[PDB]
Amino acid sequence: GIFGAIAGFIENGWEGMMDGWYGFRHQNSEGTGQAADLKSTQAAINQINGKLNRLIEKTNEKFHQIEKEFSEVEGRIQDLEKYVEDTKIDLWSYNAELLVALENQHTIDLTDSEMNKLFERTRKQLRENAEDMGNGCFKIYHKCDNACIGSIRNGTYDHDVYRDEALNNRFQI
Amino acid sequence: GIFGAIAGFIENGWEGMMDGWYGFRHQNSEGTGQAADLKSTQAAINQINGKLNRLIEKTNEKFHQIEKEFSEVEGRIQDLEKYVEDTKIDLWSYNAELLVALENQHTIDLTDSEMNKLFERTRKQLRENAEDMGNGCFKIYHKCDNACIGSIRNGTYDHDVYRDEALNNRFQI
Amino acid sequence: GIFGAIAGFIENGWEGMMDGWYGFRHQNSEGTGQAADLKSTQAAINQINGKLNRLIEKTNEKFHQIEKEFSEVEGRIQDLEKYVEDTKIDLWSYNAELLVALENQHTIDLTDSEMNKLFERTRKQLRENAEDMGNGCFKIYHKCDNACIGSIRNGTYDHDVYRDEALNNRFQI
Amino acid sequence: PGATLCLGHHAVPNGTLVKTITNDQIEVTNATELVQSSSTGRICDSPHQILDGENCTLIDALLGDPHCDGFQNKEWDLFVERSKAYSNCYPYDVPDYASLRSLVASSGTLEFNNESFNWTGVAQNGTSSACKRRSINSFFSRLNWLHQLKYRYPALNVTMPNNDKFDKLYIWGVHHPSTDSDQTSLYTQASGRVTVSTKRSQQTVIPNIGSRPWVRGISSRISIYWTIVKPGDILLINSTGNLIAPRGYFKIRSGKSSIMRSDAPIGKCNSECITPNGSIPNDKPFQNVNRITYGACPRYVKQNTLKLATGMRNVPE
Amino acid sequence: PGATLCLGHHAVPNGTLVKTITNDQIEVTNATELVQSSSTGRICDSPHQILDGENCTLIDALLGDPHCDGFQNKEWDLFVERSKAYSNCYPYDVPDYASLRSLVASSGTLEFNNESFNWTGVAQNGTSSACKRRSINSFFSRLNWLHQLKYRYPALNVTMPNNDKFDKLYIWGVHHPSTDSDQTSLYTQASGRVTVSTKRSQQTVIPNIGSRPWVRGISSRISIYWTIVKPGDILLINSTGNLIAPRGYFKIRSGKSSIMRSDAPIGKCNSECITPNGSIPNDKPFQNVNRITYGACPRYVKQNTLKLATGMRNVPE
Amino acid sequence: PGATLCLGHHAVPNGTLVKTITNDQIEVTNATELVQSSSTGRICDSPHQILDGENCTLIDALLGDPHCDGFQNKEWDLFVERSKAYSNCYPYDVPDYASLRSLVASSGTLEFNNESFNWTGVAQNGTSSACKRRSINSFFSRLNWLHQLKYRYPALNVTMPNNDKFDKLYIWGVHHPSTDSDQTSLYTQASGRVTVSTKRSQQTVIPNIGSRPWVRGISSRISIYWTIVKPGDILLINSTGNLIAPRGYFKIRSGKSSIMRSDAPIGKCNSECITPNGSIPNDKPFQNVNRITYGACPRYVKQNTLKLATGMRNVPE
Ligand SMILES: CC(=O)N[C@H]1[C@H](O[C@@H]2[C@@H](O)[C@H](O)O[C@H](CO)[C@@H]2O)O[C@H](CO)[C@@H](O[C@@H]2O[C@H](CO[C@]3(C(=O)O)C[C@H](O)[C@@H](NC(C)=O)[C@H]([C@H](O)[C@H](O)CO)O3)[C@H](O)[C@H](O)[C@H]2O)[C@@H]1O
Ligand SMILES: CC(=O)N[C@H]1[C@H](O[C@@H]2[C@@H](O)[C@H](O)O[C@H](CO)[C@@H]2O)O[C@H](CO)[C@@H](O[C@@H]2O[C@H](CO[C@]3(C(=O)O)C[C@H](O)[C@@H](NC(C)=O)[C@H]([C@H](O)[C@H](O)CO)O3)[C@H](O)[C@H](O)[C@H]2O)[C@@H]1O
Ligand SMILES: CC(=O)N[C@H]1[C@H](O[C@@H]2[C@@H](O)[C@H](O)O[C@H](CO)[C@@H]2O)O[C@H](CO)[C@@H](O[C@@H]2O[C@H](CO[C@]3(C(=O)O)C[C@H](O)[C@@H](NC(C)=O)[C@H]([C@H](O)[C@H](O)CO)O3)[C@H](O)[C@H](O)[C@H]2O)[C@@H]1O
Ligand SMILES: *[C@@H]1O[C@H](CO)[C@@H](O[C@@H]2O[C@H](CO)[C@@H](O[C@@H]3O[C@H](CO)[C@@H](O)[C@H](O[C@H]4O[C@H](CO)[C@@H](O)[C@H](O)[C@@H]4O)[C@@H]3O)[C@H](O)[C@H]2NC(C)=O)[C@H](O)[C@H]1NC(C)=O
Ligand SMILES: *[C@@H]1O[C@H](CO)[C@@H](O[C@@H]2O[C@H](CO)[C@@H](O[C@@H]3O[C@H](CO)[C@@H](O)[C@H](O[C@H]4O[C@H](CO)[C@@H](O)[C@H](O)[C@@H]4O)[C@@H]3O)[C@H](O)[C@H]2NC(C)=O)[C@H](O)[C@H]1NC(C)=O
Ligand SMILES: *[C@@H]1O[C@H](CO)[C@@H](O[C@@H]2O[C@H](CO)[C@@H](O[C@@H]3O[C@H](CO)[C@@H](O)[C@H](O[C@H]4O[C@H](CO)[C@@H](O)[C@H](O)[C@@H]4O)[C@@H]3O)[C@H](O)[C@H]2NC(C)=O)[C@H](O)[C@H]1NC(C)=O
Ligand SMILES: *[C@@H]1O[C@H](CO)[C@@H](O[C@@H]2O[C@H](CO)[C@@H](O[C@@H]3O[C@H](CO)[C@@H](O)[C@H](O)[C@@H]3O)[C@H](O)[C@H]2NC(C)=O)[C@H](O)[C@H]1NC(C)=O
Ligand SMILES: *[C@@H]1O[C@H](CO)[C@@H](O[C@@H]2O[C@H](CO)[C@@H](O[C@@H]3O[C@H](CO)[C@@H](O)[C@H](O)[C@@H]3O)[C@H](O)[C@H]2NC(C)=O)[C@H](O)[C@H]1NC(C)=O
Ligand SMILES: *[C@@H]1O[C@H](CO)[C@@H](O[C@@H]2O[C@H](CO)[C@@H](O[C@@H]3O[C@H](CO)[C@@H](O)[C@H](O)[C@@H]3O)[C@H](O)[C@H]2NC(C)=O)[C@H](O)[C@H]1NC(C)=O
Ligand SMILES: *[C@@H]1O[C@H](CO)[C@@H](O[C@@H]2O[C@H](CO)[C@@H](O)[C@H](O)[C@H]2NC(C)=O)[C@H](O)[C@H]1NC(C)=O
Ligand SMILES: *[C@@H]1O[C@H](CO)[C@@H](O[C@@H]2O[C@H](CO)[C@@H](O)[C@H](O)[C@H]2NC(C)=O)[C@H](O)[C@H]1NC(C)=O
Ligand SMILES: *[C@@H]1O[C@H](CO)[C@@H](O[C@@H]2O[C@H](CO)[C@@H](O)[C@H](O)[C@H]2NC(C)=O)[C@H](O)[C@H]1NC(C)=O
Ligand SMILES: *[C@@H]1O[C@H](CO)[C@@H](O)[C@H](O)[C@H]1NC(C)=O
Ligand SMILES: *[C@@H]1O[C@H](CO)[C@@H](O)[C@H](O)[C@H]1NC(C)=O
Ligand SMILES: *[C@@H]1O[C@H](CO)[C@@H](O)[C@H](O)[C@H]1NC(C)=O
Ligand SMILES: *[C@@H]1O[C@H](CO)[C@@H](O)[C@H](O)[C@H]1NC(C)=O
């Protein structure tokens, strides 16, 4: 939520996009399409896998320790043995709760970050040929067939080629 | 500070806004006004209340523990009892210091985030009828009475209705 | 990485900038230049020094504690003394690992934040006289000698003075 | 003429200082305190069962010191030991006094069932002027001072099987006479012996004749010991002299019970958290009132105060 | 006619709830569990060396209880004590039983070297019907019951120097006869004494005559003690009666060895982490199966479950 | 022709690797080390008061071993025990040696006030060739070896009241003769006894006759015990033989004092933090030099190194 895109100015996700986490949905004269963006999807997945690798199978080897169950009443020494262990468990329980809370807040923020990065990447690409509609969609002011859409996704779109046409439509009266 | 709005490109806050955390201040031909934005104010407050609920009254029940004050010199066992307790207090003291430091840094960043979100919400709404003056203020290039200001705040502003008028003023020579 | 500037839409850093962390590189008719921006450089350095001051020389005074090396086999009491200490070391070791991980992630994000802030500061300054090329560079659509570049860096650039000239070049056909 | 629309945020004239990762003093609009640093000064008698020891230690209530007779068979969630407490019976010491205090405090009950031990051969119910009940020479309510009968102290051998489902806690003692004549007068033999045992354990005590610093009329001492008999187990007591015998057992439970040292008065109020300074509210997560707590309490920390920002950074006009 | 290009993100119909700093229930597309909360129910015999105690405690294997003769000289990474274990030799107790169990468990070996002690003056190899080997009266394999020879028990004085590089662990005992006639019959003197010592330490035990609750034919007891002799040091044993002598020493190492109480069966599998509930996988960083673990294990926590978000916030269509 | 203005950031050819939440190796422009992993090799004699034990343990200085006479009445912030230390007086052992060492180390002073005990009835000032002062037979400076006078050792009964504001620490002993003739020659009775007591406590020791591994001429031993007398309390010593008597008390404080084992030499330098490896700087928050520290120290951790990023991510040209 820290960038306001996911669960913000984007009203909902696309349950139909199943080859990526972030993508494009276009409508032009040739029809309507949906294609996933890989660089931003891979960027979010790699970061989340990084977290997991720092947590999964990094465990502690312990061997002989202290007794933690008791069949007799003993008093002073047993109290301290129980206290030591109860103190340790509470502290690791706290570490566990905070760890998950922190990581989850960051996972939500970094996925929001990666959405915004893709939005910003596209916005600079389209230069003065398009206008942000405010809901994660750009209005493209020129003829843009599927090969033209593909060049935007692929990052090969020459804005100069359509500038005159878009400027005319953008600033018509 | 992470978005640079609060204590950044906004020079100071408004001590006079007492019905919200974020808002609008306008000047047109009908006069000058101030109105608080609720969705962004509620968004920041709900997040901060979320933090508090995770901290307030979640305490630990403890009953019989170890002794922590001593009237005699005893040596080995007393040293360990003091050490155990002194170790526990230092660790929870550390947890407390880091918790507050982390939470406060995030509280400042999320309030900065919510300011930026409102700025961005408005900027996309005004389309090509306005220009960012750089200090958190937009210059609106058309006649915009109080009902026109209200539609911006309320989110009902049709930019198409004023586009021709604003484009003429924006690109005059 | 959270703002996508450093190691994002900026392809690499400048090894040649040695008087600052963030800066400007321009090309006009008078030549090509490089000058560091102080307010953003000082902003990042002050934040990082703030972290260091919270960590450097804040240590704990301890005097008589428990024994931690043993020459004889003793059993129950020695086991608890070893366990207490081994538990303490593991917990502080964990605190140390998480501290550095958290701080480093934030240091990378705040330096990325400060880069973006400078980019945004410049973008609003240039108003409608320039266009974002998408790689951290602005194309300036008017005659801008070195005194004109200096006014941008210094924050004294009157965009009104060049607006007519830039608007003509921007919207030519 | 156009129009200008400015986006902004609020501010206050009276901000608060908080710490962050990068800054140990930054002003925000509002904050809340996370360290409970004040107490009410009194221990709330609710919602926990508070037992005010008043003039009595727990041990003296256990043993049955006469001015502690009122505490018989009471239970407690928290036993409060006052510094004004005193012992007013036969002078005694307890090897591992601390462990006996903790196990009884933890068990949370003074429930005592009497049991019929076969002390045929010795006189019972010995008394002393150091331990008076309404001016009359008496002894610990829960202990039985056995001495000679017609100048003879036979080898005692008595059994008590635990056929119940619960554990039995037996408290017993050994008299250490000041003089050899006191030894032979009371117990006939030149030196006594006491062996309390079960199937799993044993404790054998040889008395030590010799005077001890005078305490309240006496220069001898009674050493106090304890024995826990499990179900199916049997208590076996032997003595050729100096045995201070138990009159029964205490029930010994496990629960949320404990004991605290404090001179804070008891009040009529409701508070989950108890410190020796008195009850404190548990709305905050941390506290630096006392490292000794009982109940649902904030966790002790060294810090006076820890301010949690509840508002944005403050930038006044 | 133009075109419209929309930027977006994916979503799922079946999201998962996770906790954050600001929210204790927020839906993400996917999550993974961080608390191991299930066990296989069996202890994997790999990769650690598991010693199933079966019917024997570690102490009874150490002493040489006849039905524990199979455990002689075995090593272990983890010794598993079953609740069905029983003692079937001469009844005994051990002062600081727990410390002896821990040091042997920690040492991880039952290796025993025999040593030739000069017991000239007393008969050796005493036996009893409470401790039978194939119906024949016998005794603890590692202990030597010394008694009188032709109605005489001289003052024993035997030395054993540790000239090895390792420490020596000596286990020895004291007989506490039920009756005075049993004392004089076995050891001639009216009361015995045992003193085991080194250059640095000493332990002196006076036996206590008197019966104890009947256990498996006997009403006397043997108290068990231990002594560690360092290199260059000398074991010195003295007795005027009641000495239960060692037949040698145990090697005493330091390693990764320990002991666990569990009735979980042993299985043919490979698992690094052992709990009394059985082996658990160690892929997760936390677990709430048991606070008692052995090996490379997730750390115990109180929580059932802790869900780590592995995907963005979920916003369905 | 226009102009182009590029925003950017710096970079370096020699970046450093750091860990983050999402990455365990990422290059930044600069970093700083947070784990102190080196020592100077010597213990700085400032700002703390260092007492180099040299050839003497703390206990031997306490008791008054002749080659330790120089340590009398010294105070210390940190007592440094060398491995080359040796005992060169009468052979002894100390039940709970560790507790006596810790309480004296913690107290931080060897201050000793002499006191006039009434030993009328016995000879004083016994000596031995195992404890020489300038070739002359002597004894522990702070202990008084009482033995018979004209073949008689009466029942000693001596009192010493603590009428001071501070606690008194009394160190006393028991002689365990090698032979019965040695017992009767020194103390006349066939077996001795020692009882030191206060109003609150008692310690009674029966000596044990019998030889012990030969140490420096002697095969007997002296057992060392201690007693703390509170203000208003009274020290009561009784003996029918074998008492090693105190010549006074030690002051027993509470402070910042302790004791460390190390063979690191003492140097002329200033360093707040002391480890057995020598002083270390305390500029960093963590250290992995030693888990044993004294003073204002970085906290011990298992990690070699922990690099804190002090610069942005590094992206070279
Ligand atoms: C049983 C008794 O009366 N003992 C007293 C003892 O009597 C001796 C007599 O039994 C023997 O046959 O002959 C000699 C010489 O003829 C003695 O007379 O004498 C002691 C010294 O005079 C007394 O000590 C004094 O006791 C005082 C008060 O004593 C009581 C007490 O109140 O504590 C009386 C109690 O009934 C008695 N307990 C029992 C179970 O009989 C206790 C107990 O003997 C002692 O407390 C244990 O040490 O004593 C004063 O305390 C006085 O200061 C003290 O000298 C014997 O009481
Ligand atoms: C050595 C022996 O046989 N002792 C038995 C004792 O014999 C006395 C005799 O030695 C003495 O000179 O004269 C008197 C009177 O004439 C006795 O006869 O008598 C005791 C009571 O009758 C016996 O106790 C009984 O022992 C039974 C089984 O005993 C064994 C055992 O199996 O535990 C036999 C063992 O050989 C013996 N151990 C050694 C090293 O000799 C042990 C040992 O003496 C005891 O276990 C220690 O207390 O006893 C039954 O246990 C029966 O219940 C019990 O009354 C003496 O055994
Ligand atoms: C007091 C004394 O001289 N005792 C020695 C003992 O003398 C006996 C005599 O007192 C008795 O009346 O008659 C018999 C037979 O006629 C003896 O002669 O004899 C022992 C064995 O011969 C000696 O043991 C030897 O002691 C040697 C050195 O002893 C000293 C020492 O330096 O440790 C001398 C000290 O003055 C003495 N301490 C005191 C307070 O008098 C100590 C002390 O007695 C012992 O250290 C305690 O065990 O002994 C050698 O150590 C030799 O190895 C050893 O056999 C008695 O010393
Ligand atoms: C600085 O920030 C703090 C923390 O965010 C903030 O304090 C909070 O204010 C709220 C609302 O005023 C307090 O809520 C009250 O809590 C008590 C119990 O402690 C309730 O009984 C109260 O209930 C009343 O109001 C309810 C409204 O729905 C009714 O349902 C009810 O019947 C009562 O009429 C009330 O909700 C809250 O306790 C504090 N929290 C803390 C930690 O202090 C404070 O407002 C900020 N300071 C400033 C100057 O703005
Ligand atoms: C929710 O998120 C979780 C966590 O991110 C995610 O689960 C992970 O999925 C991966 C890939 O499917 C799992 O990887 C497997 O791990 C096992 C060992 O545990 C490997 O042996 C497997 O190897 C196979 O595939 C490899 C591909 O290179 C081959 O090299 C190999 O020979 C095998 O063919 C496999 O890689 C991973 O275990 C889980 N992680 C966890 C913690 O569960 C899950 O996909 C997400 N859920 C949904 C519904 O999307
Ligand atoms: C990598 O980052 C580290 C950490 O940020 C950075 O190291 C720091 O450099 C500063 C400045 O060079 C060091 O400051 C010095 O500290 C000592 C005490 O340790 C002071 O005595 C020094 O004082 C001198 O300079 C002062 C300037 O005002 C004078 O007042 C004074 O009289 C002296 O002339 C000096 O300030 C600091 O110690 C380090 N910190 C650490 C943790 O090392 C380093 O520069 C970066 N590396 C690179 C290659 O850039
Ligand atoms: C061994 O020495 C101790 C210490 O001197 C002896 O105890 C002392 O005994 C006398 C009387 O015998 C005590 O005096 C009494 O004091 C009380 C109240 O203080 C007074 O009311 C009596 O009338 C009497 O005067 C003295 O205080 C006491 N000292 C202590 C410390 O208890 C002990 O009796 C001696 N034993 C032998 C066998 O000599
Ligand atoms: C001191 O008292 C105890 C307790 O009464 C005595 O022990 C008891 O001794 C009798 C026999 O002397 C035991 O009876 C026996 O029981 C077994 C099996 O239960 C039976 O097979 C025998 O034939 C015999 O009947 C009794 O159970 C036993 N009690 C306990 C608790 O062990 C002890 O002997 C007494 N000592 C003296 C010196 O009087
Ligand atoms: C009980 O047995 C021990 C062990 O044998 C006896 O101690 C031993 O006593 C002899 C002399 O009586 C010692 O020899 C001496 O050695 C020193 C230096 O090593 C030498 O200088 C002497 O001249 C003498 O030869 C022997 O070493 C010693 N052993 C030990 C381990 O101390 C003890 O005396 C016996 N007690 C009885 C009552 O028999
Ligand atoms: C609560 O009571 C404790 C215990 O008496 C107080 O802490 C002691 O304060 C004295 C002087 O005020 C210090 O010298 C002691 O070191 C403290 N005791 C311990 C064990 O550290 C504490 O100040 C009281 N707090 C409140 C809020 O009443
Ligand atoms: C693993 O075994 C432990 C120990 O038996 C189980 O914990 C006990 O559960 C009982 C009732 O089920 C509770 O009354 C006890 O308080 C628990 N013991 C302790 C020491 O807390 C545990 O439930 C088992 N877990 C699994 C997953 O099998
Ligand atoms: C500081 O001294 C300690 C203690 O001697 C050193 O740690 C020991 O190192 C040996 C081998 O070098 C290991 O076998 C031991 O396990 C270590 N001891 C403990 C208690 O773990 C340590 O290496 C020294 N460090 C420095 C920097 O000098
Ligand atoms: C974009 O890349 C895809 C994948 O290789 C390719 O099939 C497509 O033709 C490309 N389109 C353009 C316009 O470059
Ligand atoms: C905006 O909403 C407010 C609140 O209901 C209303 O009073 C006002 O008339 C609205 N104005 C416009 C322009 O929608
Ligand atoms: C910008 O500031 C620098 C530093 O003082 C100065 O040298 C330069 O002349 C200034 N240029 C402009 C255009 O203000
Ligand atoms: C310490 O002992 C050694 C060998 O006994 C000796 O050389 C050295 O001088 C002694 N130093 C002191 C201060 O006693």
Residue numbers in the entry:
A (entry chain B), B (entry chain B), C (entry chain B): 1 to 173
D (entry chain A), E (entry chain A), F (entry chain A): 9 to 325
Please quote the authors directly.
Influenza HAs bind sialic acid (N-Acetylneuraminic acid, NeuAc) containing glycans (sialoglycans) on cell surface glycoproteins and glycolipids as their primary biological receptors. Previously, we and others have demonstrated that over time, IAV HAs within the human H3 subtype have evolved more complex receptor specificity, selecting for elongated α2–6 sialoglycans featuring at least three linear LacNAc (galactose linked β1–4 to N-acetylglucosamine, Galβ1–4GlcNAc) repeats beneath the terminal species-defining sialoside moiety.
Importantly, this alteration in the positioning of LacNAc sugar residues (a change equivalent to approximately a 30 – 40° shift the positioning of the GAL sugar ring relative to SIA, see C2-C3 bond) appears to have become permanent, with bound ligand conformations observable in essentially matched positions through the following approximately 20 years. The alteration in receptor binding conformation shown in Figures 5C – G is principally contributed by HA variation in the 130- and 220-loops making new H-bonds with galactose and sialic acid.
